[PDB]
């Protein structure tokens with residue numbers, strides 16, 4: 001080798017870069033391709049594996065982020081801008097990143113990060129997805145993948161093979177193929193790969209657990225605030241088709257045959273599709289899960305629920321959880337009365353509307369049912385209560401109760417579940433109090449940022465991040481987040497009978513049972529039953 005930053009891989013030779021890590025240093029390989037650029041006539045198709053290359057691929061800088069809608073609701077605002085692309089956007093975007101410990105290890109554990117963003121945005125290159133503190137602190141090879149989002153990734157004319165749909169999931173699978181085939185040269189154990197991810201990354205993980213074509217490519221799985229059965233995470237092939245033809249209609253396109261339609265859509269510039277993306281949604285939910293995975297009979301042989309009942313999925317160990325206020329950012333962005341700079345107390349009227357916004361698929365009875373469920377009628381004009389109740393509505397319906405359904409289903413067949421509730425609101429949070437513990441805001445703990453002194457996290461936050469990185473890495477290494485026979489308090493296994501989970505915050509650990517049963521019984525059993533009858 002005569003070098004640490006040089007690696008020969010079944011695709012090509014790769015030149016690394018040396019990086020500082022809290023006064024130490026590590027190796028890092030940025031922007032390694034794993035597939036052919038999906039440009040021109042390749043748009044909306046299955047990816048192809050990268051054609052192997054003569055020479056030294058300069059893997060010393062982050063790659064172009066994929067093409068997505070950017071978030072300008074708060075220009076200049078870091079809380080919101082941290083999530084936007086920070087490298088140039090381009091259809092040429094299927095690369096990946098490895099952080100290897102230094103000195104290069106023998107065959108140690110690999111974690112692969114799959115970003116979220118609702119399947120319409122996201123980027124592998126964000127400050128908070130910086131793999132170096134975790135790769136360093138826990139001695140793991142940390143990969144981060146990238147995948148087409150939006151129409152580029154999920155336009156779906158089932159029957160067609162030109163835009164079959166799901167292709168963004170296939171992007172991830174191929175990144176995962178590549179880890180299977182090449183991570184050995186980098187010091188990592190291809191028999192010890194944990195895929196982890198948040199939001200749509202969390203659901204993508206769960207979809208790889210489910211899909212036959214992906215199960216064999218990894219060992220263990222972490223799902224953070226996302227689950228494949230989330231209502232924003234998939235659509236029927238009928239509704240993908242319907243939505244895809246509506247992108248044509250919106251862009252003046254021939255609609256007689258798929259060939260016609262795809263051809264038209266392939267001619268248009270990127271920002272053009274992005275600009276009419278919103279306008280495919282029936283009406284509506286706020287924000288733009290236009291193009292998402294399809295239940296296609298291929299990647300997904302049958303319906304998720306049926307897969308999940310029959311046990312048709314990978315049986316291994318999972319670690320997963322939710323944040324206390326998943327819903328808060330949705331309300332801020334899409335619902336009246338809710339604004340970044342006020343306490344956002346909610347009139348009783350703005351509650352009726354907010355309910356309607358959050359449960360689009362429901363009839364008047366559904367809305368009454370949800371309203372009854374979440375309303376204190378001894379004090380129905382409390383604007384804090386109404387504001388918080390709406391938050392819980394949105395959080396439970398879209399993240400917690402689908403996640404709890406998945407957990408109870410998986411655990412009947414799987415080989416060990418661990419379940420967390422992250423309810424710490426960070427000291428240095430730039431968002432207003434009423435949002436609480438926000439969708440996405442445990443990521444920074446997982447990826448080590450509170451160990452950087454520059455960023456003003458408290459010491460008790462430094463200890464939390466260290467504890468969490470350990471749980472995560474110990475779990476990836478062993479299928480269990482606890483240390484062999486250590487003094488520290490044990491995070492119990494989640495079981496069907498007893499359903500224990502822990503909080504994840506600065507106070508000493510507490511174990512609980514049945515995370516949000518009452519509401520989840522409502523969302524998972526009662527409400528669907530009531531809508532199917534009426």
Ligand SMILES: c1ccc2oc(CNCCCCCCCNc3c4c(nc5ccccc35)CCCC4)cc2c1
Nearest residue numbers: 080083116117118199200232326329330394398439440
């Ligand atoms: C209620 C209803 C639907 C929901 O779907 C999801 C899962 N993914 C949604 C992410 C797509 C919206 C992201 C646009 C802004 N990017 C952010 C993202 C996240 N958190 C944010 C918090 C505050 C402001 C912006 C955030 C975390 C996920 C990455 C994108 C969560 C969720 C909650």
Ligand SMILES: *[C@@H]1O[C@H](CO)[C@@H](O[C@@H]2O[C@H](CO)[C@@H](O)[C@H](O)[C@H]2NC(C)=O)[C@H](O)[C@H]1NC(C)=O
Nearest residue numbers: 315316317411413414415416417479493494495
């Ligand atoms: C995970 O699976 C392992 C192995 O597939 C299970 O361990 C076996 O348990 C049976 C009965 O408990 C024993 O007869 C064997 O000695 C164990 N085998 C091994 C290889 O350890 C284990 O119980 C499963 N874990 C969970 C939490 O479901």
Ligand SMILES: *[C@@H]1O[C@H](CO)[C@@H](O)[C@H](O)[C@H]1NC(C)=O
Nearest residue numbers: 015017056057058059060061
């Ligand atoms: C790798 O690429 C970047 C792009 O500007 C450059 O800064 C860096 O010095 C290059 N290294 C080599 C080996 O050329």
Ligand SMILES: *[C@H]1O[C@H](CO)[C@@H](O)[C@H](O)[C@H]1NC(C)=O
Nearest residue numbers: 078428430453454455456457
């Ligand atoms: C704490 O650090 C931040 C960096 O995000 C810095 O901008 C800020 O000025 C510091 N706080 C105070 C009170 O000076």
